[PDB]
């Protein structure tokens, strides 16, 4: 490959053969991160200003993927990306991604890759991406993922771009939730990706690519629901959320190809914690396909229990990662007596509860955690398992830990 200053000098001579050959040479050496050199930064910024001028006038269909690939490489550098944060620049990339509001697969992927880098780091690009309404045809392409057909990497970066837009812009988040039927659209995309219907066999194992797309779908669903779901919900919004919860029930029961299972269960449970509390009853709505407890299938509740144990092993200071699963389990225990007795039997058999490495000793230690969120939910979880009896709660957890649920907060 050749150095940025050489590429810029190649364009200055203007011979079409030296230009493309310089771009493709640069694209091969700099496609990996070990090539990026602090010393060549001003040459990269110089090259970025040249290329945004070309991109904004338009890219010829041949060499189009070559130009975008250079822009995509340059966009990894923070100091070069503002050169591209313009209406004309984003609009040009939106067209080559075919999400401009007004089918070359490799041009599509490179533009989506460019747009992901641009909006991620620039408040101006975030403002321009919202104004350009890229979310509309981004969502419409996701809905047509069955009728139409796109490669997995295009599908992934559509969802990644959708994730970034909903994460970085409140107004894009509201648009997808309130006016673009985002929950229904992405619940549909999740079922297609999972390959199972709500009422079918519990999904056992998900392929690696489907896991990547499904996790992105779960993250977008998290974005548009952590903010906008009032906890009281009508009959139409209850059924979709129950429909979605049944898909999340599959995710809980299943593993992900490779070692992505716990990350896959992390995004599933995070979303479960966003649903209206009443819709969590789907987690107890399994038939026997095998863990029976007082007539109720506890396999889902047992699976959330295993995930809770796994993540308590694997987190030093980030115990907050288990607050979603604890609140889901708490409301299951609070709403359903058989789930409460099972969880108490599994966690709390009949002197210093904070000592040990059984599951109950680890949960009790969370009751005094630094993160206020996780110390209160772990406290309420065990309090509910104790049938909300303060004496029993104190006996099983010790008064120093149980005080975080009584007003005796502040004596300690």
Residue 386 inside a domain? The answer is yes
Instruction: Say which experimental method was used.
Output: X-ray
> Which domain range does residue 105 map to?
4-405
Residue 215 inside a domain? The answer is yes
For 7-70, give the secondary structure using H, E and C: HHHHHHHCCHHHHHHHHHHHHHHCCCHHHCCHHHHHHHHHHHHHHHHHHHHCCCCCCHHHHHHH
Residue 228 inside a domain? The answer is yes
Other C-beta atoms lying within 10 Å of the C-beta of residue 140: 12
User: For the stretch 268-301, what's the b/e string if a residue is b when 16 or more beta carbons lie within 10 angstroms of its beta carbon?
Assistant: bbbbbbbbbbebbebbbebeeeeeebeebbbbbb
Residues 390 and 396: their CA atoms lie apart, in Å, by 10
Residue 283 inside a domain? The answer is yes
Other C-beta atoms lying within 10 Å of the C-beta of residue 353: 22
Residue 245 inside a domain? The answer is yes
Residue 180 inside a domain? The answer is yes
CB contact set of 316 (below 8 Å; sequence gap of 6+): none
CATH of the domain at 241: 1.25.10.10
Residue 71 inside a domain? The answer is yes
Residues 272 and 213: their CA atoms lie apart, in Å, by 18
Read off the DSSP letter of residue 292. Answer: E
Task: Give how many domains the chain has, as a whole number.
Answer: 1
Instruction: Tell me, in Å, the resolution of the deposited structure.
Output: 2.3
Residue 411 inside a domain? The answer is no
């Amino acid at each position: 490959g050749m150095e940025p200053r050489a590429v810029a000098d190649a364009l200055e001579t203007g011979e079409e053969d030296a230009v493309t050959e310089a771009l493709r040479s640069f694209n091969r050496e700099h496609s990996q991160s070990f090539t990026f050199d602090d010393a060549q930064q001003e040459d990269r910024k110089r090259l970025a200003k040249l290329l945004v001028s070309v991109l904004e006038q338009g890219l010829s269909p041949k060499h189009r993927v070559t130009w975008l690939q250079t822009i995509r490489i340059l966009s990894r550098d923070r100091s070069c990306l503002d050169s591209f944060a313009s209406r004309q620049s984003l609009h040009a990339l939106a067209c080559y991604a075919d999400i401009a509001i007004s089918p070359d697969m490799d041009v599509l992927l490179e533009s989506l890759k460019c747009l992901c880098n641009l909006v991620l780091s620039s408040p101006t690009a975030q403002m321009l991406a919202a104004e350009a309404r890229l979310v509309v045809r981004l969502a419409e392409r996701v809905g047509l993922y069955r009728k139409r057909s796109y490669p997995h990497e295009v599908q992934f970066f559509d969802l990644r771009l959708l994730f970034l837009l909903t994460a970085l812009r409140t107004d894009v988040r509201q648009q997808l939730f309130q006016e673009l039927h985002g929950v229904r659209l992405l619940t549909d995309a999740l079922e297609l990706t999972l390959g199972v219907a709500p009422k079918e066999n519990p999904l056992v194992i998900l392929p690696a690519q489907e896991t990547e797309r499904a996790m992105e779908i779960l993250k977008v669903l998290f974005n548009i629901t952590f903010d906008s779901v009032k906890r009281e919900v009508d009959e139409e919004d209850a059924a979709l959320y129950r429909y979605l919860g049944t898909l999340l029930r599959h995710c809980v029961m299943a593993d992900a190809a490779g070692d992505r299972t716990e990350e896959f269960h992390g995004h599933t449970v995070n979303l479960l914690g966003n649903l209206p509390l009443k819709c969590l009853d789907v987690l107890l709505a399994l038939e026997l396909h095998s863990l029976e407890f007082m007539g109720v299938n506890m396999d889902v509740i047992n699976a959330l229990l295993a995930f809770l144990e796994k993540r308590l092993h694997q987190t030093h200071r980030l115990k907050e990662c288990v607050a979603p699963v604890l609140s889901v389990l708490t409301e299951c225990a609070r709403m359903h007596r058989p789930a409460r007795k099972f969880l108490k039997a599994q966690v709390l058999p009949p002197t210093r509860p904070e000592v040990g490495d059984l599951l109950r000793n680890k949960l009790v230690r969370l009751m005094t955690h630094l993160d206020t969120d996780v110390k209160r939910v772990a406290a309420e979880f065990l309090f509910v398992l104790c049938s909300e009896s303060v004496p029993r709660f104190i006996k099983y957890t010790g008064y120093g830990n149980a005080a975080g649920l009584l007003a005796a907060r502040g004596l300690m």
